[PDB]
Amino acid sequence: NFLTATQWIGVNTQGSSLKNANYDLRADPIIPKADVGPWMMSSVDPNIYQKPLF
Amino acid sequence: QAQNFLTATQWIGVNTQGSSLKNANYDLRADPIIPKADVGPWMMSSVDPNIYQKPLF
Amino acid sequence: PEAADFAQFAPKNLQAQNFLTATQWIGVNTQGSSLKNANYDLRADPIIPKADVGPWMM
Amino acid sequence: GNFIQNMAFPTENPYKLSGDFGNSTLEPTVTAALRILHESPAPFNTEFFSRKNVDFIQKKLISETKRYTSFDIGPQNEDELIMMMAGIYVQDSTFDGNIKAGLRKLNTLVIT
Amino acid sequence: SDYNAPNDFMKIYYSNIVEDKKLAEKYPFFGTGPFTGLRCRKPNNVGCNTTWVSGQLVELTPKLKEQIECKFGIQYVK
Amino acid sequence: GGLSQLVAYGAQDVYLTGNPQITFFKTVYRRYTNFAIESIQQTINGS
Amino acid sequence: GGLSQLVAYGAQDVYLTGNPQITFFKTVYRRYTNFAIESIQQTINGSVGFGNKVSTQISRNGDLITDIVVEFVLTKGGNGGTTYYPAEELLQDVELEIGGQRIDKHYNDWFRTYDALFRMNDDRYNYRRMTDWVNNELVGAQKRFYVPLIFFFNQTPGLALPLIALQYHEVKLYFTLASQVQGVNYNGSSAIAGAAQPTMSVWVDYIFLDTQERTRFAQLPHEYLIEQLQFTGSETATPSATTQASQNIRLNFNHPTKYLAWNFNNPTNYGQYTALANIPGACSGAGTAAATVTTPDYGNTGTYNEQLAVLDSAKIQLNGQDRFATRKGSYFNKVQPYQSIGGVTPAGVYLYSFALKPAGRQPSGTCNFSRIDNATLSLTYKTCSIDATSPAAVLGNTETVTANTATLLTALNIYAKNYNVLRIMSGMGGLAYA
Amino acid sequence: AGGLSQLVAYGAQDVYLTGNPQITFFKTVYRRYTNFAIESIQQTINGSVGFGNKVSTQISRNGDLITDIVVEFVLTKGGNGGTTYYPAEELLQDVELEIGGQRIDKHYNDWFRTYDALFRMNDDRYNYRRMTDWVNNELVGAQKRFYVPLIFFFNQTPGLALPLIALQYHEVKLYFTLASQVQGVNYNGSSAIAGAAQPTMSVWVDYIFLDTQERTRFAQLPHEYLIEQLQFTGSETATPSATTQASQNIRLNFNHPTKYLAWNFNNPTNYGQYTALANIPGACSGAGTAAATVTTPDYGNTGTYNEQLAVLDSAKIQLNGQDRFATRKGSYFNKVQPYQSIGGVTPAGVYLYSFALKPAGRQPSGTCNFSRIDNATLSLTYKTCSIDATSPAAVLGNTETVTANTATLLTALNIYAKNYNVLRIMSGMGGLAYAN
Amino acid sequence: QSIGGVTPAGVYLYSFALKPAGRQPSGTCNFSRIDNATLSLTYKTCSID
């Protein structure tokens, strides 16, 4: 009877912040969060919970 | 018979400064040679190591 | 039955020609529906298992 | 004695996009068929429009023409074959989950 | 600060910023079914049923799993 | 939006976009021989 | 000198010249087939005159055909300033058939619309010289005009029609001549007494092939990727001083469309896509006491002044959903051409491309309207409140308004340009997509 | 006989053209392309739009790739016809392109004017003017929507479409600065125009929607795009004296493989003024009559092709102390360089020197790598400003080495360099490769 | 369609749910995953005396 605990999402987690999201109705393939180069790296969380309907 | 061998850019001169004078050290002490290691794949610079031919010390 | 085998015909190498004309199958539907191909839903539209059964199911 | 007259005929048409289907890595020919069908990738579709099935059909068209007529023909252009396959596929594609039986019928219709 | 000290050049970065490497190697792929976000082994939902704790992805082991089940009953069906 | 055009793809488009050979959204420029151009004055003989 | 640049080589140059693949300093020409071009006159069946329909069958004199020019000899029925592309106006329409099948059909208005969007600079001026009087000629002046056809085979050798491969099929053109041509046999609605009838001749430029090229054409099947023009005319919603009219027009088009093109016009005056006004060139006698805003300065019928155009905005809706955000008429008139063609489109003529390069031969994106069944062109018109006879109002007005005389633009011509395929085999041919 | 008489006229000289033929002209083969669609989508502009304000937008991820960008502006004339000159171009003072916080490029209103002066042409140029100005003798209060296309590398060709999709973790922004004043719109020379309207602005981006395999390739593969950047600095002009010929050595603080340099001399007072004012019909306010003044241009006719009103006598580019080429006259940079390399008509006061074989194109065709030149400089010689600008006899009947006394108003020098760099995208992030 | 009551003029509703008046979730619009959510309104002309 606990809504905040499942095997897919996780335990004690919330949805990540939204910044520069994919406005398209397509899948927008979530590239793995790779840190390439020690400079100007970005801190955005990918939309792992964007369902690929199309 | 033989003809003249047209030389390369070696007759127009040898560029010695290159791009070493763009960020040259103004101190009399020679700056330590920092190697051109991996500093990411998309924000690199291209000048020169700027090593002193005579360290003056 | 028409055109009696002409073994004396020399150009028997008709490889340089494309005889298939797919002009009659451009824009067809399942059987005979008319909805201008109905590409409305922007999705994959999965395969529906249409089994050739009689007028009833079982 | 007719060899030369026959040999004289070219076997390579300077066709738009000669070697039209396959011979490219940008995207599969199966996908092109799925896109005109507007169907999901599925075993029925990926077997029917597969390179091995397209090849099967092309070989049958060549072989059967040679069996039925005195003529030697080439493979047919594949935009024409894909469009025809998809057309036939749209108007039938009837099976109960038995992909093999379904395919047998659909290939029959395309070849025919 | 101190001169005679270790140079913390990205030590903090490899220690707890970059990727929790042991998980990343054990579980090199990502779930594609509604397990999305979860690192896992093998295809789409095959070597999956790994987990997410309070902050980041962590291996689901029969320590964490059991503690969670005791407080938050979860079936965890692979 | 534009997605309604992507889906507007039929048998009559197979020759145009099925099994694509090229794209128009990524170009590769050729690597070319290094050269330089200089405008040089010539000497005119005669008045 | 230049050598100081060559030696200036480093890492940033590798992407441009390292392991070089090409040069610019050595041209390799390709060896090509042996062919010749001959200009041969065709005979027009029936009789030539205003309002008549005539036709011609292209003879089998060469192997392939391309360029076609329809000559017309006209005499001015009035002075300079009274005509506007009269040879273009005269050739009311042209049908193209192969094997008795319609391949395409052009309209005088299409030629005008086509020019408006796709011709430019000097080629466009020269075109005007081939269809009109541009040197202030006077009444009775006689000129031979050359109206080029713009069917796909009339634009490039690459799409020449292989008459040689059409042993069992004929190729024919049909020309409808206008009942009236401005400044030639009519002045507005009034006939010009004594006006001469046109002399017409159709010229076809034939390609003669040498032995191997000829033989291959005769025995191999031929497929061309060609263009077609789709067209339907309709009434415009009529704007007025009291309202911004709006209209939803079903886009009764099919096949993979490169682009749509359209214009609003006053069917009374050929080529008039804008409102009349008392500003120089915008009406008969504009700028003086005798000016009238019921009749155009025919010799200056066209204009780039969007203030006299009637489209406020437009969008294309497909299957109920917007294809792109609504944009102003000036987007379709000025920007679309900038972005995709590079020419300059006159006010009242609009373009929307579904293609990256709509002016070229190479496919670059299409909208397949046979797969879209609820396609609609949605238009918003400008308010017709500006007093056309008063330059202060004509020239000092706002984005959403136009001339009161803009309500005369009661007709709309919507065109679409699409691809199709011309297939020729065994001496016969026709089109792959209906 | 007839066309056949040409075909049969075959000999040795023809072998080189048609022997063993390789190609034909009578059969075109096209390349098969991918499935894609394009859409014009409005962006949200943050900040307050108005004269002198700086506003910006993050390009939304409404497609996979982006190409064309057009900025719309709505302005009303603050005076009658002839008072404005490409005012929407003047208005958009500058545009900055940033990816992932790194500046990729930046253009200025003057660049748009310079670029146009050198690279647009014929009806393209005219149609361009129609989108940025009032060219149909419009009157005060007239309202028009202007469309200012951007000219960044991705706004020129699909080939360099910016793979917005491959930048899943890095934002792409456009920063726009609007001019404090726009001639003939809110100011007439130095005088503000009471009641002038503030601009309405909208930014449109054309987004490309790719089908699945192509989309996936862009989303997953690393990419390297060879793209262009604009380098620009302003310099003080060694303004010529009315008594002699000034000269100047300008350090060129440029880097990277440069396609070309471009420059102009101007009077900052009047946007687009690259030449001297004079009492001849095409060179000043009221020119040709009693009311003429040579202190103010006929703004609608600000530009001219008459080099008599320009100030450059001659110039050379020196690299690391050595002359790159022999000194050539200003008219050589104004007329010949662009004749040879572009093919259009460059207005007086605007100069070009190419280091490239085809600088108007996109394919690299020879560049000067300024990153390997320790000290590049531009050396200029100016014309003597001795001609009485108010006297057509003097203005039009003068010599090669002189110009108008009003040419001394052209006190600013703008030097541009267009170069190549590489935009490298990987793992959802991307910044231009070379730092300098 | 969704409530079964009568709403007075000037008050508007748009449901993303089948039964918004109940307690059981019946479809929702997650605005935490919608970077841009815009309500577009067009007003009537105020011309009536």
Curated annotation (Swiss-Prot), chain C:
Record's subcellular location: Virion
Induction details: Expressed in the late phase of the viral replicative cycle.
Signal peptide bounds: none
Highest taxon in the source lineage: Viruses
Comment text on domains: The hydrophobic region might anchor the protein in the underlying inner membrane.
Subunit and partners: Interacts with the major capsid protein.
Its biological purpose: One of the minor capsid proteins that constitute a network internal to the major capsid proteins and outside the lipid membrane. The minor capsid proteins glue and stabilize the capsomers. the p11 zip protein binds together the neighboring symmetrons.
Protein name, UniProt field: Minor capsid protein P11
Organism per entry: Paramecium bursaria Chlorella virus 1
Swiss-Prot record, chain E:
Compartments it resides in: Virion
Keywords: Capsid protein, Disulfide bond, Late protein, Virion
Chief place of localization: virion
Superkingdom of the organism of origin: Viruses
Paired cysteines (S-S): C40-C48
GO CC terms of this entry: viral capsid
Induction: Expressed in the late phase of the viral replicative cycle.
The keyword Endoplasmic reticulum is annotated on this UniProt entry: no
Function: One of the minor capsid proteins that constitute a network internal to the major capsid proteins and outside the lipid membrane. The minor capsid protein P12 does not serve a cross-linking function between neighboring capsomers, it may play a role in the viral capsid assembly.
Domain description: The hydrophobic regions might anchor the protein in the underlying inner membrane.
Subunit structure: Interacts with the major capsid protein.
Name this polypeptide is given: Minor capsid protein P12
Protein encoded by which gene: A139L
Shown chain mapped onto the complete sequence: 73 to 150 of 151
From Swiss-Prot, chain F:
Posttranslational modification: Myristoylated at the C-terminus. Glycosylated; highly branched oligosaccharides. The pattern of glycosylation sites are unusual.
Lineage top rank: taxon: Viruses
Compartments reported by the entry: Virion
Induction or repression: Expressed in the late phase of the viral replicative cycle.
Function: Major capsid protein self-assembles to form an icosahedral capsid with a pseudo T=169 symmetry, about 190 nm in diameter, and consisting of 1680 major capsid proteins trimers. The capsid consists in 5040 copies of the major capsid protein (hexamers), 60 copies of the penton protein (pentamers) and 1800 minor capsid proteins of different types. The minor capsid proteins form a hexagonal network below the outer capsid shell, stabilizing the capsid by binding neighboring capsomers together.
Miscellaneous notes: The viral capsid possesses up to five major capsid protein variants. They behave as asymmetric capsid components.
Family to which the UniProt record says this protein belongs: Belongs to the NCLDV major capsid protein family.
The protein's name: Major capsid protein
Source species: Paramecium bursaria Chlorella virus 1
Full-protein positions shown: 3 to 49 of 437
From Swiss-Prot, chain I:
Note: The viral capsid possesses up to five major capsid protein variants. They behave as asymmetric capsid components.
Span of the signal peptide: none
Part of the intact protein present: 341 to 389 of 437
Similarity field: Belongs to the NCLDV major capsid protein family.
UniProt PTM comment: Myristoylated at the C-terminus. Glycosylated; highly branched oligosaccharides. The pattern of glycosylation sites are unusual.
Record-given protein name: Major capsid protein
Function: Major capsid protein self-assembles to form an icosahedral capsid with a pseudo T=169 symmetry, about 190 nm in diameter, and consisting of 1680 major capsid proteins trimers. The capsid consists in 5040 copies of the major capsid protein (hexamers), 60 copies of the penton protein (pentamers) and 1800 minor capsid proteins of different types. The minor capsid proteins form a hexagonal network below the outer capsid shell, stabilizing the capsid by binding neighboring capsomers together.
Inducers of expression: Expressed in the late phase of the viral replicative cycle.
Compartments where located: Virion
